[PDB]
Amino acid sequence: MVPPKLKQALELFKSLPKELRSQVLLEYAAKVPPPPPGVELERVHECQTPFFVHADVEGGKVRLYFHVPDEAPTVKAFAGLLREGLEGESPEAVLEVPPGFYRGYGLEEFFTPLRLRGLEAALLRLQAQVRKALTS
């Protein structure tokens, strides 16, 4: 099931005031460092913008990597929220995460049911990139 680091962010979100929730989603993106030189990110067709993600596990922790060209706030926001409650997590917990772990809160109403389509692909994709790690 979804980890705490995340459940916390979400729980805190649905708990935080909308107005704030907005500023929160922003901060998150602000807390999104760039990937290392070499790593290869896969574009997320599902999403309109050229959103590149890359899930992996080094040692015994997961390593999330996002790349936003237009540095979209709504695109980065999520990308951040993902790592916010995944970065450092396990490759099994990150997989145990459903494609709609933001429904039981108040994120969907933030990134719309459309924008989600793309954001989602992010997880689904990563989750597909993790399976490898398991036996990488």
Instruction: State the structure-solving technique.
Output: NMR
Q: What is the CATH number of the domain that holds 18?
A: 3.90.1010.10
Measured on CA atoms in the order 17, 20, 21, 27, is the torsion positive or negative?
negative
Structure token digits, residue 127:
């989750």
75-108 residues labelled b (16+ CB within 10 A) or e (exposed): bbbbbbbbbbbbbebebebbbebeeebbeebebe
Counted domains in the chain: 1
Structure token digits, residue 76:
């980065």
Of 24, 32, 50, nearest to 86 by C-alpha is 32
CA distance 33 to 14: 25
In the DSSP assignment, the letter for residue 120 is H
Domain that holds residue 41: 1-136
Helix (H), strand (E), coil (C) string for 7-69: HHHHHHHHHCCHHHHHHHHHHHHHCCCCCCCCCCCEECCCCCCCCEEEEEEECCEEEEEEECC
In the DSSP assignment, the letter for residue 126 is H
51 close to 43: Cβ distance less than 8 angstroms: yes
7-15: long-range pairs with CB below 8 Å, 24+ = 7/85, 8/85, 9/81, 9/84, 9/85, 10/85, 10/101, 10/102, 10/104, 10/105, 10/107, 11/105, 13/105, 13/106, 13/107, 14/104, 14/105, 14/106
Instruction: Tell me the chain's radius of gyration from C-alpha atoms.
Output: 14
Q: How many residues does the chain have?
A: 136
CA distance 109 to 80: 17
